[PDB]
Design a protein around this nucleic acid. Structure first.
Ligand SMILES: [Mg+2]
Ligand SMILES: [Mg+2]
Ligand SMILES: [Mg+2]
Ligand SMILES: [Mg+2]
Ligand SMILES: [Mg+2]
Ligand SMILES: [Mg+2]
Ligand SMILES: [Mg+2]
Ligand SMILES: [Mg+2]
Ligand SMILES: [Mg+2]
Ligand SMILES: [Mg+2]
Ligand SMILES: [Mg+2]
Ligand SMILES: [Mg+2]
Ligand SMILES: [Mg+2]
Ligand SMILES: [Mg+2]
Lengths: 60, 354, 107, 61, 153, 50, 63
RNA sequence: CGCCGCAGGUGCAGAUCUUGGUGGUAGUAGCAAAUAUUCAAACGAGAACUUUGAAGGCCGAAGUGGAGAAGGGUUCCAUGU
């Protein structure tokens, strides 16, 4: 789960996550929060684990 | 009313041998601590020695649990206490002339023997270590002897902290702000009978005015800094946690529920380390801490270049003189200070013993 | 003795006479509580839940004419309360009320 | 340990973009620490890194 | 703080005070005049009787529309009531007053309410809604209370 | 309503973020003269402009 | 102490109404510790929450 | 501030005067549309009103039910006061 820019579409979020974190993502769901910030649920590839990607990001 | 105490001679004996184990593992730690070693390696081998020794002792009563009462914590010149790096975390390399501070705890029947010591590594045989770091360890050692001498039921708890402040001002040092020693009963390291050192207005009013009572266990703990007395955080992961059995909450995570169950099986009531688990443990610990099911033991830092020393040990209170079951290997022959004690009471207590 | 237990029959019809339809059954339990206060001298009266059902068995206005209760003076078991004794009023089902006297019930 | 525009002006475009990229990575980690508790030291470094990003971009432009 | 009617012997006197207490001024004034000059034990028993409706306070000044009662014949009056909130507030102030008495050291078995006064506190404002789109006040009338007890026997 | 435009939702987002108490440390600032948020809005009491 | 959340959760887990939810009056503290639907499921399995039967509306008189 | 001169947005009881404040009325009118509550326990300083259980009732499928449109805009949901 990420807080992304309000102008970024699903394609931009998909490429940004791949470039910044060197992982492959399956799909991106997008909503805009009531406070105005866009939130992206970024599902990862089956061969990638979100648990240890969260460790290397530092949000565990 | 059903809680156990030192009234049993079998409790006396298991205190002594558990303290002897705690002393022999500090001795093996201080001998193994040479240049080029890793603090992570030292902590994992120290806890491995504790686990096998506790398993091999008291094998005739295995309904209870014997093991770690406090994880092996090794802090070096910048960390106050509660330090235990993980495998994924960065390591520290030990160099020449660095003073390191090791805390350790062993338990039987939930009753706990606790001990710490500060010592410089790679010290040449028979030589002298000087500097502003060589008097903070001496003042802390005099604090440990002060606690040993005057620990006796019939004294006010405030006499301890004023004595430590007096010897600190004599040595031009100060204690660590808001450090608490504790009274130790069965499966308890956070006893309500607590001793404060370096207080302020806010902590003094939160403290309790109490008098020491006969036939119990104490863990006198002194933390002396040669600097100013500032302890904060610089973004290091907190590893040591302790379960709080008074509170509970409905966990919403499967991994946090499994992690909490693992705490119940292994370290149910006493502090532990995340090293014993780690990929799922780091996730399962933050949500339990968020709902205050585990009390974090935060790592503390000071300004770079300052130096702190720890000295703590369990002391048994019996009316015919208190006794020591855990001791740290310190020698004043190779350690001297540039400033001496000028108080008559302080020089009297270090001379006299029970 | 203050741990006494007795059987009483309360003329609910007598004490409810004149009360309106929507106040009859609630007034019956106030008169039962007053009955226990007078008979046992205890300010604290606890109506049993089965007796509450018996009073309300036929609705809010068609309260039974007679009820057979048992009054039990007991120690409060809570020293913090002002009252040393309380009366527990239980329900006693009876086929008929003829020739029924106020009797003493042993332990 | 700071970055000055005075000594940035000798740098080429390639290493200027490298220095900007490292600052952006550092800031993204500082935003991570901000929402995961972090520390007062890392929170106060957010403005310093943000100023450094502005400094590098000003010299580039 | 500056009381009115400073005690003749401040050594043998204890003081209690409350401000902006959310009770009716008119009810509390009548209750205060009833317990004035009473012994501390007698006033405590009297205020407990008022809440139980065994003794009543006579409404002498603010008696517009106040009904009659049989217990008002204890006083030389006909109108009386049983202000529960006023009796409970004065009971709290009496417990505070006697607690100040043990703190000063004078014994509490001979205290007499020599002074008691109810002042009007600043009004709190609320609204009520009337027939033709009108808003009218629904103000509260809180009160300050001060009392002085004195040792005498 | 559930159906809304992006412009309206963005407007309500700003009003939501704006409707919050002032920080406690503001009272300690030098020459504050601020007691409480005078622009606090409740949904039932005062309606928004739109 | 206040089992409004637990009664609401139990009705959704049992797929019945709050009329038909029976929380144990003796194990009030055990119910109050359940803040998730899965905890409600454990209580239902362990007999601390029972789905009450339908009120009898017989058709014997009609038949 | 007094004295010699100078200059006025220079004197209040009214104007169903303007603004602000406060009384008597007055602890008064009143808190009366749609049948209805009761017992026990828990938490809690405190319970007619909260919660749970047991009763007795009402809406009676054109509902006091389950969902939506417009409108509201966080009222949603946990915890705490
Ligand atoms: Mg969408
Ligand atoms: Mg009149
Ligand atoms: Mg109206
Ligand atoms: Mg209108
Ligand atoms: Mg409206
Ligand atoms: Mg004029
Ligand atoms: Mg005028
Ligand atoms: Mg005028
Ligand atoms: Mg005129
Ligand atoms: Mg009236
Ligand atoms: Mg009325
Ligand atoms: Mg009907
Ligand atoms: Mg509907
Ligand atoms: Mg709600």
């Amino acid at each position: 789960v990420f807080i992304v820019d309000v102008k970024a579409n699903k394609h931009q979020i998909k490429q940004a996550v791949k470039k910044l974190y060197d992982i492959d993502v399956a799909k991106v769901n997008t909503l805009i929060r009531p406070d105005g910030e866009k939130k992206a649920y970024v599902r990862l590839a089956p061969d990638y684990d979100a648990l240890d990607v969260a460790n290397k990001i530092g949000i565990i | 009313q059903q809680e156990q105490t030192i009234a049993e001679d079998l409790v006396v004996t298991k205190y002594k041998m558990g303290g002897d184990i705690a002393n022999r593992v500090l001795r093996s730690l201080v001998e193994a601590s040479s240049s080029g070693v890793s603090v992570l390696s030292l902590c994992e081998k120290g806890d491995a020695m504790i686990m096998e020794e506790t398993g091999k002792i008291f094998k005739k009563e295995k309904e209870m649990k014997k093991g770690i009462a406090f994880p092996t914590s090794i802090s070096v010149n910048n960390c106050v206490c509660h330090f235990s790096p993980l495998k994924s975390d960065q390591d520290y390399i030990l160099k020449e002339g660095d003073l390191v501070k090791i805390d350790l705890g062993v338990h039987v029947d939930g009753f706990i023997a606790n001990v710490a010591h500060t010592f410089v590594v790679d010290v040449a045989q028979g030589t002298q270590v000087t500097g502003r770091k060589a008097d903070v360890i001496k003042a802390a050692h005099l604090c440990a002897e002060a606690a040993l001498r005057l620990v006796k039921p019939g004294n006010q708890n405030t006499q301890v902290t004023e004595a430590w402040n007096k010897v600190a001002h004599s040595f031009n040092c100060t204690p660590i702000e808001g450090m608490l020693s504790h009274q130790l009963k069965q499966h308890v390291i956070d006893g309500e009978k607590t001793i404060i050192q370096n207080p302020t207005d806010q902590q003094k009013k939160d403290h309790e005015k109490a008098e020491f009572e006969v036939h119990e266990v104490y863990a006198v703990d002194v933390l002396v800094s040669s600097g100013e007395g500032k302890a904060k955080d610089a973004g290091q992961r907190t590893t040591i946690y302790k379960r709080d059995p008074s509170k509970q909450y409905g966990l919403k995570m499967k991994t946090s529920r499994a992690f909490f169950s693992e705490v119940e099986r292994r370290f149910d009531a006493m502090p532990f380390t995340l090293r014993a688990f780690e990929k799922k443990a780091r996730m399962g610990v933050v949500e339990c801490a968020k709902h205050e099911l585990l009390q974090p033991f935060n790592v503390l830092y000071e300004k770079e270049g300052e130096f702190v020393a720890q000295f703590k040990f369990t002391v048994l209170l019996m009316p015919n003189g208190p006794m020591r079951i855990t001791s740290g290997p310190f020698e004043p022959d190779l350690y001297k200070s540039e400033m001496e004690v000028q108080d008559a009471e302080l020089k009297a207590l270090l001379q006299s013993s029970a | 003795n203050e741990v006494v237990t007795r059987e009483y029959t309360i003329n609910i019809h007598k004490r409810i006479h004149g009360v309106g339809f929507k106040k009859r059954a609630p007034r019956a339990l106030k008169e039962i509580r007053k009955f226990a206060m007078k008979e046992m001298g205890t300010p604290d009266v606890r109506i049993d839940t089965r007796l509450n059902k018996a009073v309300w068995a036929k609705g809010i206005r068609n309260v039974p004419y007679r009820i057979r209760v048992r009054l039990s003076r007991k120690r409060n078991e809570d020293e913090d309360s002002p009252n040393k004794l309380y009366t527990l009023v239980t329900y006693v089902p009876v086929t008929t009320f003829k020739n029924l006297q106020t009797v003493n019930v042993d332990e | 340990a700071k970055i000055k525009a005075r000594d940035l002006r000798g740098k080429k475009k390639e290493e200027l973009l490298k220095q900007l990229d490292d600052l952006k990575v550092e800031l993204s980690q500082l935003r991570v620490a901000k929402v995961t508790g972090g520390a007062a030291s890392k929170l106060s470094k957010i403005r310093v890194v943000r100023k450094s990003i502005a400094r590098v971009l000003t010299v580039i432009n | 703080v500056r009381y009115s009617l400073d005690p003749e012997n401040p050594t043998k006197s204890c003081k209690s005070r409350g401000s902006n207490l959310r009770v009716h001024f008119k009810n509390t004034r009548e209750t205060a005049q009833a317990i004035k000059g009473m012994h501390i034990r007698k006033a405590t028993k009297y205020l407990k009787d008022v809440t139980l409706q065994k003794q009543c306070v006579p409404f002498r000044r603010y008696n517009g529309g106040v009904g009659r009662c049989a217990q008002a014949k204890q006083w030389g009056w006909t109108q009386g009531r049983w202000p529960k909130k006023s009796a409970e507030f004065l009971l709290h102030m009496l417990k505070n007053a006697e607690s100040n008495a043990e703190l000063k050291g004078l014994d509490v078995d001979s205290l007499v309410i020599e002074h008691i006064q109810v002042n009007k506190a600043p009004k709190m404002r609320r609204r009520t809604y009337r027939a033709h789109g009108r808003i009218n006040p629904y103000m509260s009338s809180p009160c300050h209370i001060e009392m002085i007890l004195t040792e005498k026997e | 309503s559930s159906h809304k435009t992006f412009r309206i939702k963005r407007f309500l987002a700003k009003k939501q973020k704006q409707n919050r108490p002032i920080p406690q440390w503001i009272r300690m600032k030098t020459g504050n003269k601020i007691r409480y948020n005078s622009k606090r809005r409740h949904w039932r009491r005062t309606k928004l402009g739109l | 102490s206040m089992l409004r959340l637990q009664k609401r959760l139990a009705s959704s887990v049992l797929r019945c109404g709050k009329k038909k939810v029976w929380l144990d009056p003796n194990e009030t503290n055990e119910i109050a510790n359940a803040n998730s639907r899965q905890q409600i499921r454990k209580l239902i399995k362990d007999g601390l929450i029972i789905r009450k039967p339908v009120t009898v509306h017989s058709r014997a008189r009609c038949r």
